[PDB]
Amino acid sequence: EEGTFLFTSESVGEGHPDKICDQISDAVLDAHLQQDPDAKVACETVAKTGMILLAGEITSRAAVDYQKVVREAVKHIGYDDSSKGFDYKTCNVLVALEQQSPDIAQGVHLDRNEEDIGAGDQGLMFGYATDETEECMPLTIVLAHKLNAKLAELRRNGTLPWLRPDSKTQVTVQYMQDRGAVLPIRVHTIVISVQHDEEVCLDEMRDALKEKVIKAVVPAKYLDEDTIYHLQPSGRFVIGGPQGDAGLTGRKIIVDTYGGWGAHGGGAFSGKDYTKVDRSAAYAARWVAKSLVKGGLCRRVLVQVSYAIGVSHPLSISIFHYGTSQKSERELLEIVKKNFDLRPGVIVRDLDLKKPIYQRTAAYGHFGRDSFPWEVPKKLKY
Amino acid sequence: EEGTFLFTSESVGEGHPDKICDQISDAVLDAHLQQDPDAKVACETVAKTGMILLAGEITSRAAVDYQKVVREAVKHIGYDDSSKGFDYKTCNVLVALEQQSPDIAQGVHLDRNEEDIGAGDQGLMFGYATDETEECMPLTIVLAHKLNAKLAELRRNGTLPWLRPDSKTQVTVQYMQDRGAVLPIRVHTIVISVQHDEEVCLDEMRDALKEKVIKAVVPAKYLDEDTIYHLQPSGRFVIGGPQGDAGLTGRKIIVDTYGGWGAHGGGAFSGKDYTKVDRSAAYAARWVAKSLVKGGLCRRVLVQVSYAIGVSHPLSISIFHYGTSQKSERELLEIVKKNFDLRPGVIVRDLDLKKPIYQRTAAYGHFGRDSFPWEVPKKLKY
Ligand SMILES: Cc1[nH]c2c(N3CCCCC3)c(-c3ccccc3)nn2c(=O)c1-c1ccc(O)cc1
Ligand SMILES: Cc1[nH]c2c(N3CCCCC3)c(-c3ccccc3)nn2c(=O)c1-c1ccc(O)cc1
Ligand SMILES: C[S@@+](CC[C@H](N)C(=O)[O-])C[C@H]1O[C@@H](n2cnc3c(N)ncnc32)[C@H](O)[C@@H]1O
Ligand SMILES: C[S@@+](CC[C@H](N)C(=O)[O-])C[C@H]1O[C@@H](n2cnc3c(N)ncnc32)[C@H](O)[C@@H]1O
Numbered sequence: 117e118e119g120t121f122l123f124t125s126e127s128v129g130e131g132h133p134d135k136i137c138d139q140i141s142d143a144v145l146d147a148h149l150q151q152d153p154d155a156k157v158a159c160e161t162v163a164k165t166g167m168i169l170l171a172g173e174i175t176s177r178a179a180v181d182y183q184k185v186v187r188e189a190v191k192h193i194g195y196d197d198s199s200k201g202f203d204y205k206t207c208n209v210l211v212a213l214e215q216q217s218p219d220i221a222q223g224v225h226l227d228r229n230e231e232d233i234g235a236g237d238q239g240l241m242f243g244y245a246t247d248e249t250e251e252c253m254p255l256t257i258v259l260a261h262k263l264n265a266k267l268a269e270l271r272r273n274g275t276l277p278w279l280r281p282d283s284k285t286q287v288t289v290q291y292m293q294d295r296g297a298v299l300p301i302r303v304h305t306i307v308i309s310v311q312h313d314e315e316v317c318l319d320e321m322r323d324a325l326k327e328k329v330i331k332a333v334v335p336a337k338y339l340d341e342d343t344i345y346h347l348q349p350s351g352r353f354v355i356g357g358p359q360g361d362a363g364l365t366g367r368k369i370i371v372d373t374y375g376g377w378g379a380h381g382g383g384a385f386s387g388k389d390y391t392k393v394d395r396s397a398a399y400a401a402r403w404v405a406k407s408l409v410k411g412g413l414c415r416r417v418l419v420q421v422s423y424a425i426g427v428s429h430p431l432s433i434s435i436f437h438y439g440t441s442q443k444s445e446r447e448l449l450e451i452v453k454k455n456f457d458l459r460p461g462v463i464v465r466d467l468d469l470k471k472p473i474y475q476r477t478a479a480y481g482h483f484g485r486d487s488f489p490w491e492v493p494k495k496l497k498y
Numbered sequence: 499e500e501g502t503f504l505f506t507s508e509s510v511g512e513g514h515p516d517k518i519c520d521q522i523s524d525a526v527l528d529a530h531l532q533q534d535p536d537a538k539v540a541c542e543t544v545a546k547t548g549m550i551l552l553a554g555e556i557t558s559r560a561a562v563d564y565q566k567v568v569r570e571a572v573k574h575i576g577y578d579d580s581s582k583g584f585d586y587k588t589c590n591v592l593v594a595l596e597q598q599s600p601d602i603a604q605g606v607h608l609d610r611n612e613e614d615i616g617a618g619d620q621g622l623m624f625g626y627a628t629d630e631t632e633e634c635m636p637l638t639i640v641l642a643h644k645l646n647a648k649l650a651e652l653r654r655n656g657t658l659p660w661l662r663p664d665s666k667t668q669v670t671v672q673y674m675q676d677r678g679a680v681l682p683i684r685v686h687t688i689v690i691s692v693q694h695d696e697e698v699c700l701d702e703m704r705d706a707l708k709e710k711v712i713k714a715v716v717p718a719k720y721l722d723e724d725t726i727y728h729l730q731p732s733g734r735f736v737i738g739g740p741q742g743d744a745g746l747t748g749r750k751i752i753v754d755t756y757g758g759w760g761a762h763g764g765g766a767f768s769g770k771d772y773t774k775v776d777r778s779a780a781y782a783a784r785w786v787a788k789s790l791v792k793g794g795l796c797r798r799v800l801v802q803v804s805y806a807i808g809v810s811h812p813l814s815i816s817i818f819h820y821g822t823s824q825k826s827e828r829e830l831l832e833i834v835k836k837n838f839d840l841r842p843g844v845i846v847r848d849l850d851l852k853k854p855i856y857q858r859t860a861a862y863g864h865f866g867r868d869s870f871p872w873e874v875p876k877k878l879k880y
Binding site for chain 2: 359361364367427
């Protein structure tokens with residue numbers, strides 16, 4: 117017990133109503149980028165019973181069929197029948213989209229060289245990396261995401277046909293201190309809540325969630341007789357998706373990042389093109405942090421950057437190594453300065469941020485998966 | 499420079515479109531609570547040009563005039579004419595509100611003793627306190643909020659009649675390490691962006707923002723010849739409010755809390771009654787953290803708690819004192835156990851969370867202001 121502590125993170129499934137909105141917002145972004153790599157996109161999505169509303173600002177040369185893009189995203193998630201609470205074929209899709217404000221456009225990107233475009237807004241952003249997993253992510257959030265992915269897998273393969281797309285999971289891990297780094301010891305508590313059909317009973321669900329979901333995801337070495345399980349703790353979850361709870365874009369920002377570890381500056385990712393530093397600078401900050409850890413300079417590290425609207429270079433850059441670096445904080449900042457250029461008009465080139473890959477980022481976290489450009493460490497010169 | 503670092507936080511004004519939504523959601527909550535202290539409220543607000551949409555779930559004995567509640571909140575904020583981009587008298591108010599899901603109700607509160615109500619959702623929440631200011635908040639966020647409040651003051655008193663309600667500010671402070679605590683040294687950079695009328699010029703605005711806003715808020719001892727000012731950095735901000743940028747409830751969660759310090763579990767506060775632990779447990783965690791600091795046990799402290807839907811007691815409670823306590827982490831946890839009961843049905847009594855004071859929390863941060871119950875430290879027994 118000496119030197120140990122508990123930490124909890126959560127994740128949600130593809131049909132969680134907030135995550136539906138993130139995925140739709142990024143499907144819209146991708147559709148624009150497929151035709152206009154320089155589309156300016158700020159697409160919020162709102163979901164409630166029978167309704168997807170798109171609201172925001174897009175200036176783009178693309179011709180996008182919003183009805184088709186939205187409905188295909190909902191179909192992919194799995195909401196295809198009134199019996200499940202939501203159906204892509206028959207829901208309302210409402211659009212309240214205007215051009216980007218000309219005042220923003222003139223102050224950010226109009227008549228600017230691409231590398232010297234200003235940040236699309238002010239704000240602060242953080243990147244984090246931890247050596248506790250190979251992918252440099254906290255175990256709590258990785259396991260929580262993988263539990264949701266397993267539910268979707270067993271729904272889609274017909275193993276557990278009573279499952280529906282809306283789910284939430286939560287994992288509490290006991291950690292040991294290790295010279296500023298952290299070492300996972302065991303799983304203390306798991307929560308799983310998932311929408312289900314009217315016919316399956318709680319005992320069938322709880323047994324399946326333990327044997328076919330948890331045991332198929334969480335290594336047995338982390339589970340013991342004392343692990344606490346809260347499986348379908350509400351007792352009934354037939355109503356779900358947007359019918360059970362309104363969804364909005366950008367309401368799962370901690371799920372999207374580090375599960376509470378590190379820090380967060382408040383900005384949402386989905387529905388935004390590269391000029392919105394909330395996304396591009398957070399991706400670049402992750403890339404920096406992961407590069408420092410994979411480069412052997414830190415075991416655990418947090419990077420902050422901040423911007424002013426219309427100004428290309430960050431206003432501030434800061435680093436905290438948790439006592440896990442032999443280099444000083446000053447030396448780390450110099451290494452980052454010499455190896456990275458965090459202007460948005462340079463990040464876009466380094467991370468290929470005009471490519472329409474964003475819908476793939478919008479469930480199961482933006483980091484630690486799939487070797488996206490910000491997950492491929494840069495070789496550092498020093 | 500040795501032992502120092504930079505940190506940035508931001509805040510937004512009452513007419514920032516996300517903050518409009520938070521305030522409307524809490525005006526709706528308050529209106530329900532005035533008539534039904536036990537109202538179940540989950541009210542999201544969305545704002546775009548000419549539109550306020552309410553979406554979510556409310557079960558309540560109250561009879562609420564949503565048109566009146568929404569329009570009065572917008573009037574208070576100051577959007578009262580088409581020349582400002584938005585007018586409470588003439589905007590569209592659309593309502594997509596349903597009852598709370600019966601499946602949630604049965605699993606959370608139906609036929610439960612109030613003290614033993616379950617958490618209204620799973621999730622994780624943090625509370626933070628720092629002795630660097632008397633109110634136990636980070637200086638970066640306090641100053642950022644006060645800059646926005648000063649803008650609203652000079653708008654309302656007619657000093658600077660070209661101001662409009664939508665604003666954002668951002669403050670970067672140089673800090674010194676102090677045995678795990680932090681000591682503010684100076685202000686490194688200030689950003690202010692505020693919506694303005696068509697007639698005032700940039701030089702008049704920038705001079706006023708420096709002399710009448712910054713100097714009226716930030717002590718001169720923090721400002722020097724090297725401080726960087728980004729005042730109206732976009733160059734033009736005539737279009738603003740929802741017309742310039744869509745607003746949604748729960749998109750300023752870092753502004754609402756600690757400006758990036760501490761940690762955040764991802765849950766939004768506004769529009770939610772006490773059974774939604776995203777709000778009540780975050781408020782209680784702040785109360786715990788502030789009580790530990792004001793009790794002289796810590797100089798700086800972070801508390802995590804987590805819940806499962808339908809379960810009253812937290813699943814986990816954890817504490818980090820940043821090396822600023824003479825008591826061990828184990829001893830602090832025992833003190834918290836002996837002095838606090840973090841079931842939502844007890845928090846509601848301790849913090850008086852049926853009282854309709856929530857609209858007042860929804861701008862300028864939920865913490866560090868106005869001696870709300872969670873800001874009054876508990877005298878600890880140990
Ligand atoms: C003991 C400890 N606790 C701790 C905490 N806690 C965990 C429980 C809830 C509150 C925050 C966080 C944290 C987690 C997330 C966000 C922000 C801060 N970091 N962190 C540590 O680094 C250490 C530590 C590690 C290695 C070492 O050698 C000495 C100390
Ligand atoms: C030097 C240092 N830096 C630091 C950081 N940084 C700041 C810049 C950007 C990245 C995070 C944070 C932090 C801030 C917000 C969220 C999460 C973590 N905490 N923190 C520290 O506690 C210390 C420290 C203080 C006293 C001491 O005696 C020794 C060290
Ligand atoms: C519990 S609902 C949030 C509170 C809700 N807005 C209300 O009106 O009380 C939040 C999320 O939990 C999940 N959820 C919905 N219904 C649920 C149920 N009956 N049991 C468990 N989780 C549920 C869904 O993922 C949903 O998006
Ligand atoms: C810059 S807008 C976000 C990006 C925007 N959605 C777009 O379409 O590019 C975000 C916030 O910045 C502020 N803002 C809006 N127009 C602005 C302008 N012309 N100059 C500076 N800040 C502005 C408002 O507070 C607004 O809510």
